Amino acid sequence: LKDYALEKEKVKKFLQEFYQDDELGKKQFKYGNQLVRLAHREQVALYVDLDDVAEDDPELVDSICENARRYAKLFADAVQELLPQYKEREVVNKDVLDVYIEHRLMMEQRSRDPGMVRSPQNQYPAELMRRFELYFQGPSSNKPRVIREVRADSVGKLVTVRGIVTRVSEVKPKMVVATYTCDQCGAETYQPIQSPTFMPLIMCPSQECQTNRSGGRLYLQTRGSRFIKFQEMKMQEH
Amino acid sequence: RIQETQAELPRGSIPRSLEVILRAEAVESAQAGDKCDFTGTLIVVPDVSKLSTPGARAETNSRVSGVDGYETEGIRGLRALGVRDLSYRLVFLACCVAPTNPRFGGQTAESIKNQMTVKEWEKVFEMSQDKNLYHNLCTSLFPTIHGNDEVKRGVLLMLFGGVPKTTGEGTSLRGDINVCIVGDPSTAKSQFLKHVEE
């Protein structure tokens, strides 16, 4: 039970004012440069070093280890909020998802009405506009566990294991945020995916469709939807 | 269930199989293994196919929507909108069936005679009256095989067969003869078999 706004500010401070001499004794603001590249879309994955975090705030590392998913999301949100102030030039629209993101942001700015309060279900899901991923490099202090010893007491914990890969599937497209388009209103519905499966939506929730009391059926789209490379491997005890 | 004939097969393909539906008066005219021409109409019959991927669906155009507590979503929504998959399979509705290569132009001897045409029966009678019919049939059956006159005669007598009988006690005296050709490699054994098959 802690103030996640304060935790977000702490992680933001770390990311913005952490530095090291990784390059021939040159303070370069490692994570600042990584954020610059992320904003420029020249880098997809960001690996936060919990050793670097503990260099200043060991208790934050302890909190992350005790509850990683929560703090993974906190770090992701901090990076998301930080990208605009590090952006220095225009992205070259690497891919179709970049085109979609720019279109959606442009039209949101167009229909902004900044003062108007928008319903919580009337915004773009955060995962739908990321184009980046954030992972943790486990702390050196944490001794590696054993597949047999990693039990319910470690659920939700950042564990590090070692083993032999006995099997790995091929990279498949796993849907993160399903997208739907309506046949009546021309508004996009979104359905973030957390369960291993999901039920596709039938009716449209758009304000226009609700007002008109139309049928508002909507169709699932693989175009605007968001996917991520997905692999399932099995690691084995040494 | 019928399948593609040997001639129609493309290269490296399994004979495509489809089922034909015989309605009244055509209902026991096709028998397994026969070559038959079916005349009718290709049709589509709906099928509940186990397609893992969603495809074509039929739903009402009425623009209904579920109220709070009865949101037309999920299984309830699908059942309300009457969503039903449209999956079809090609089936043949044959209005008639005939032999592809009829034996007669028209099952006792008299019945076969009547089924024969006048020209066909005249030819059969001529062949029956033809002395040397034995050698004639041997040569006609195997014109492209030299020698092996005894083998040709045996195969001919096999094609004709004997008279099966059942004793008073019920023992079924075999009436058809069996022939086995054993010989050195490349001596037309497979050729005799293929001749008889064809």
Ligand SMILES: Nc1ncnc2c1ncn2[C@@H]1O[C@H](COP(=O)(O)OP(=O)(O)O)[C@@H](O)[C@H]1O
């Ligand atoms: N006596 C024969 N008369 C005509 N053709 C023959 C004769 N002997 C062999 N052949 C030819 O040689 C090939 C071998 O015949 P095949 O049936 O394969 O013999 P086997 O049964 O020993 O394999 C065939 O193509 C056949 O046409």
Ligand SMILES: [Mg+2]
């Ligand atoms: Mg052979």
Ligand SMILES: [Zn+2]
């Ligand atoms: Zn709509």
